[PDB]
Amino acid sequence: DSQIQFTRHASDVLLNLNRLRSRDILTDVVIVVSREQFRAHKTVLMACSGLFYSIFTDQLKRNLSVINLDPEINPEGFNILLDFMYTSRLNLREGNIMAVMATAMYLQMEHVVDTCRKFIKAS
Amino acid sequence: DSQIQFTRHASDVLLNLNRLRSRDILTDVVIVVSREQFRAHKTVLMACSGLFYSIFTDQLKRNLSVINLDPEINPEGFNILLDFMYTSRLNLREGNIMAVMATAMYLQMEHVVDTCRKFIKAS
Ligand SMILES: Cn1cc(C#CCn2cnc3c(c(/C=C/C(N)=O)cn3CC(=O)Nc3ccncc3Cl)c2=O)cn1
Ligand SMILES: Cn1cc(C#CCn2cnc3c(c(/C=C/C(N)=O)cn3CC(=O)Nc3ccncc3Cl)c2=O)cn1
């Protein structure tokens, strides 16, 4: 009938999902990146990453509780991207850009990769 | 270091969460409303509703897979609100406003209740 749009709702949801992550509430996977580990919600990972979408949509892998990433992936770059997934904010710096871009390619995050390219273009 | 804001990210996440709901992927609770049932992600419910937050944050209830709502709750009003949670869009109409408002009070959704009040004020 009469539709009403709430402009802050999606950001408020994402904030609250991040609050749950910070309390480890209903997290259902650990992502292992070399010597570090990061806990998350599979649904958020799938929503933000083609790699995680492809993993958890397969019935064969959906119920995995631990995912080991490629040993070459930089844990800092992963952490930057995980925080982006839950905040919409990307901490890109000359000192991290290459690792973040390579990690975003691996995670299949095309908009982040494109933004990294724009960052390179802007020096 | 250098922070970059992605303005469409939160809405894109929510869209993808709704796509998962529509495929029943990683849904982990059924909400029973009289003769109808609705499947959802607990994390989204907790993010959007004080009632569901209070239920699932308690360790006693966190692992419940079925929640029976009060038998007085209107399934249409619940469905409208569940769709709002996953879309940011509220379908309010003269024919549903009272049931939606009462349901939003029960679900502890203050911004929706306030919007219902504004709808009443605007006739
Ligand atoms: C080498 N290389 C490959 C790539 C790539 C790619 C394509 N690509 C696939 N998938 C994606 C993104 C994405 C956005 C991330 C961002 N902000 O950049 C989020 N996803 C998951 C998704 O679409 N999930 C979904 C779909 C439908 N229904 C339910 C769900 Cl959960 C995404 O960008 C970059 N470099
Ligand atoms: C009788 N009556 C009582 C009320 C009420 C109330 C307060 N109230 C409590 N809770 C809420 C809302 C809310 C917004 C919904 C909307 N769009 O209107 C979302 N929540 C869950 C939440 O804050 N979750 C959360 C918090 C912290 N950390 C993690 C998480 Cl998941 C919320 O409005 C209305 N009528």
Curated annotation (Swiss-Prot), chains A, B:
Tissue expression remark: Expressed in germinal center T- and B-cells and in primary immature dendritic cells.
Effect upon mutating H111A: Abolishes interaction with NCOR2 and HDAC2, no effect on interaction with CTBP1 and transcriptional autoinhibition
Protein's job: Transcriptional repressor mainly required for germinal center (GC) formation and antibody affinity maturation which has different mechanisms of action specific to the lineage and biological functions. Forms complexes with different corepressors and histone deacetylases to repress the transcriptional expression of different subsets of target genes. Represses its target genes by binding directly to the DNA sequence 5'-TTCCTAGAA-3' (BCL6-binding site) or indirectly by repressing the transcriptional activity of transcription factors.
Annotated phenotype, changing N16K: Abolishes interaction with NCOR2 and HDAC2, no effect on interaction with CTBP1 and transcriptional autoinhibition
Record's subcellular location: Nucleus
The BTB domain, residue ranges: 27-94
UniProt disease link: Chromosomal aberrations involving BCL6 are a cause of B-cell non-Hodgkin lymphomas (B-cell NHL), including diffuse large B-cell lymphoma and follicular lymphoma. Approximately 40% of diffuse large B-cell lymphomas and 5 to 10% of follicular lymphomas are associated with chromosomal translocations that deregulate expression of BCL6 by juxtaposing heterologous promoters to the BCL6 coding domain. Translocation t(3;14)(q27;q32). Translocation t(3;22)(q27;q11) with immunoglobulin gene regions. Translocation t(3;7)(q27;p12) with IKZF1 gene 5'non-coding region. A chromosomal aberration involving BCL6 may be a cause of a form of B-cell leukemia. Translocation t(3;11)(q27;q23) with POU2AF1/OBF1.
Domains (record comment): The BTB domain mediates homodimerization. Its dimer interface mediates peptide binding such as to corepressors BCOR and NCOR2. Interaction with corepressors through the BTB domain is needed to facilitate the rapid proliferation and survival of GC B-cells but is not involved in the T(FH) formation and BCL6-mediated suppression of T(H)2 and T(H)17 differentiationrequired for GC formation.
Entry protein name: B-cell lymphoma 6 protein
